Ligand binder design. Structure first.
Ligand SMILES: Nc1ncc(-c2ccc(CCO)cc2)nc1C(=O)Nc1cnccc1N1CCOCC1
Length: 297
């Protein structure tokens, strides 16, 4: 019943699990959850097991397994392995081209638009998913320099059976640095879903800014810094983020010289709309995916 796997190296650590590069008797990623984190494993398993989720910008799922150990039991998620690792690490090490920015930006928007969509590309109905923890460290870089979504531990399936009371606590979920102003404010319209899609678009805007900040088409490129790196501490709290994002209406800096390049100007105008204080003023991920396809000459 169990797959012939040999764990090689610890490559990552998420909030609920450890990620290993492994040999399948070829190279796969094994995400290992302890018994205590069973709910996170089940949440990811349920998303990855949905056949309607399958997309080139969503991490390929192989199987889930329960593995008895001497000390107890582990819960595994076996997926495709992307050697280039996460986008934050990638942008820290590399200065990207305009072409790289277009491929990474468009694949990110396509992946998010697919999660958010109530239909498959072929028109069949599907469950929308909201990621709820989008950030550069959660995005995998494929060998062809396109994006790939993973880490669905905090994700929510937008099921019609969802209660208004269940969505309350829950509470503020995610990484404080990437939380939308309405999440930081505890100002969400829990009465309507799609308000959750808008929070994912805000986080996507910060990621698009990170990609843009390391693109040689801007002219002079600075060393990589995460969004708000120069204003907040390493692991910021919701209060410190609220003071910046909400009270000071603070957003990562876009120097005027970046706008000299027509492509960079279009990307900047788009991401600026996507991080608007008002969730209703934000573009949809589908709109962003369309704007990136317009960048093709
Ligand atoms: N499918 C995968 N294939 C390859 C790699 C990978 C490849 C290389 C390196 C660099 C090592 O020197 C790290 C990781 N990770 C995953 C993966 O699913 N990771 C993953 C899942 N959930 C939460 C966080 C995750 N990580 C995102 C990537 O960065 C670490 C955390």
């Amino acid at each position: 019943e169990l797959l012939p796997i040999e764990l090689d190296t610890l490559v990552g650590k998420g909030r609920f699990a450890e990620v290993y590069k492994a040999k399948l008797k070829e190279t796969v990623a094994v995400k290992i959850f302890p018994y205590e984190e069973y709910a996170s494993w089940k949440t990811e398993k349920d998303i990855f097991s949905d056949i309607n989720l399958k997309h080139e910008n969503i991490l390929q799922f192989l199987t889930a397994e329960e593995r008895k150990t001497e000390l107890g039991k582990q819960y595994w998620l076996i997926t495709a392995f992307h050697a280039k690792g996460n986008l934050q690490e990638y942008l820290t090490r590399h200065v990207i081209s305009w072409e790289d920015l277009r491929k990474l930006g468009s694949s990110l928007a396509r992946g998010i638009a697919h999660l958010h969509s109530d239909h498959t590309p072929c028109g069949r109905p599907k469950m929308p998913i909201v990621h709820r923890d989008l950030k550069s460290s959660n995005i995998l870089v494929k060998n062809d320099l396109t994006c790939c979504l993973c880490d669905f531990g905090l994700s929510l399936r937008l099921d019609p059976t969802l209660s208004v009371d269940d969505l309350a606590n829950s509470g503020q979920v995610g990484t404080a640095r990437y939380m939308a102003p309405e999440v930081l404010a505890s100002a969400m319209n829990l009465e309507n879903v799609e308000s959750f899609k808008q929070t994912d678009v805000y986080s996507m805007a910060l990621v698009l800014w990170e990609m843009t900040s390391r693109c040689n088409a801007v002219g002079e490129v600075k060393d990589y810094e995460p969004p708000f790196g120069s204003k907040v501490r390493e692991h910021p709290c919701v209060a410190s983020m609220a003071d910046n994002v909400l009270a000071d209406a603070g957003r990562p800096e876009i120097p005027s010289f970046w706008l000299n390049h027509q492509g960079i100007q279009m990307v900047c105008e788009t991401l600026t709309e996507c991080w608007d204080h008002d969730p209703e003023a934000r573009l949809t991920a589908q709109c962003v995916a369309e704007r990136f396809s317009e960048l093709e000459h």
